[PDB]
Structure formats: structure tokens, C-alpha cells
């Protein structure tokens, strides 16, 4: 079974290569134990090589297989990294084929769902400037994939947060707080919340980027999920130092937060209360 399949990934007969590729992709879309069988069979170097196939269908299906491998456990994500997939994945971020572009983004997002070391490998492969550019894609699906991927990177340690800030992501993220698309809006809030879960100077960069007026407004959102994400991100900002806290107060937050203490949702009441007590000493 799997050793023959892997051999055929190098076959000059394209029907063999594709037949082997479709069976491996099937297997890699199962559980982690199946993913491991594929990795242990030695499929990764050849799958990485197929990221240069001039055949677009083959390229895309190799990409989908890697993305599935990368939805596995952190050691499975690390094998993808150790097989040298990141440089090609980053190049693919400038593919004019939007289905290929999307699958590269999805795969990088999966890799960035790993541990902080896996996230750092994504940063070190130079993914950030392209991800930041993709935040102004006219394609909503592309934009959402880039956003998801950035949010994942921003969910790592403070050094990972710092690279996102350093790559210039903040102004784009704050602009997306005007998005009329509710999913985009939610994921931008969530990404800013993750940045604002860092150090006080990382909180200050969010403030400096102009996020507070939209955050405070969104405490009155009719979508409870949006309200909650705004309130979480704001509560993170309010956990900063005195200069951070003073800026929250001057943005008008005390009045909305008090209003929230009578909200029917207990998580909202409690979050608002925590926020207020931080802000008031």
C-alpha cells in the first residue's frame, strides 16, 4: 500500500501519480493516526516537490494533502516544516490562481495553529508581508483566509505578537473594523484582541493605531457575538498600564461599560464589571 503510493508520486506517468496522490489525500483527511502513516511512509518530500508542478490540478491536490497533514498534531505540523514546505508555501501566496492561493493560505493557517515554535517558523519563512498585503484583497474569501492565518500567528507568544505588529498589520486590521461583512469584522476584532493580550507596549500599539473608537462603538452592537469580541479586546486593553487605561476612559468607555452591567448575558456583565474595576484604580 503506502510505500508503492509514495514511489508513484515520482512517476513520469501522470495517471499513476494522480491515482497515488488521490489515495494519499483520502488517507490524510482521516485522523491523526492516518496522517502519521502517510508521514512515516515518507510522502512529505515528494508532496513538497509537487508544489512546483506545472499541472495546476496536481499542484492544488498536493496542497490540499499538506493542509490536511498540517491539521494534525503539533509533531505532524513539525514534519511538514522539517520537509521544507514553508518557502514554497510563501511563494504560492503570489499565485495568480486564486484557488491555489486560498489553499496555500489555508495550509499556512493550519501550520500557524501549532505551538509557538511552529508559529515562529511561519514568521521566519517570511510569510507576514504577504499576509498583510492580502488584507486588502478584493476577494473576500482570500481576505478571510489571510485574516484567519494572521489571527493564529497573533495567538502565540509575545514575540510572535511583536512580529505581526512589526510587519505593519495594525492599520489594515483597524480599517477592517468598518467592514460591512460580519465575519470579517469578527475575525479582525478577534485578531486585535490577541495582539492586545500581549505586553503593555503591544497594547499601546493597538491604541496608537486608532482602534478604541470602533471598539467602544461596538459595545452597542446588535450582534451579541460582535459585542462580546469588542468587549474582550477592550478588556485586554484595560489590563494595561495607566497610560493604556487613561486612553480607554477618554474614548468614552466608562458609560457603555456601566450600561452593560444590566445585560442579560452573565459573561458580558462580568467582563464589563472587571473592565470597570481595572479602569477605576
Residue numbers in the entry: 12 to 292
Passage from the reporting paper:
The armadillo repeat serves as a scaffold for the development of modular peptide-recognition modules. In order to develop such a system, three crystal structures of designed armadillo-repeat proteins with third-generation N-caps (YIII-type), four or five internal repeats (M-type) and second-generation C-caps (AII-type) were determined at 1.8 Å (His-YIIIM4AII), 2.0 Å (His-YIIIM5AII) and 1.95 Å (YIIIM5AII) resolution and compared with those of variants with third-generation C-caps. All constructs are full consensus designs in which the internal repeats have exactly the same sequence, and hence identical conformations of the internal repeats are expected.
The structure of YIIIM5AII without His tag was determined in the absence of calcium ions and refined at 1.95 Å resolution. This structure is most similar to chains C/D of His-YIIIM5AII (r.m.s.d.s of 1.14 and 0.60 Å for Cα atoms of residues 14–288 of chains A/B and C/D, respectively). A superposition of YIIIM5AII on His-YIIIM5AII based on the N-cap and internal repeats M1–M3 (residues 14–168) reveals that this part is very similar in all chains. However, in this superposition the C-terminal repeats of YIIIM5AII match nicely with the C-terminal repeats of His-YIIIM5AII chains C/D, but they are shifted towards M3 in chains A/B (1.4 Å shift of Trp201 CA towards Leu158 CA). However, in YIIIM5AII the spread between Trp33 Cα-atom distances is extremely large, with the largest distance observed between repeats M3 and M4 (the distances between Trp159 CA and Trp201 CA are 9.42 Å in chain A and 9.43 Å in chain B). This distance is probably too large for binding the target peptide in the desired conformation and this mismatch is located almost at the centre of the putative peptide-binding site. Although YIIIM5AII is considered to be a full consensus design regarding the sequence of internal repeats, the internal repeats are not identical in terms of structure. In the more stable YIIIM5AII structure the side chains of Leu16, Leu20 and Val7 adopt a uniform distribution of side-chain rotamers in all repeats.
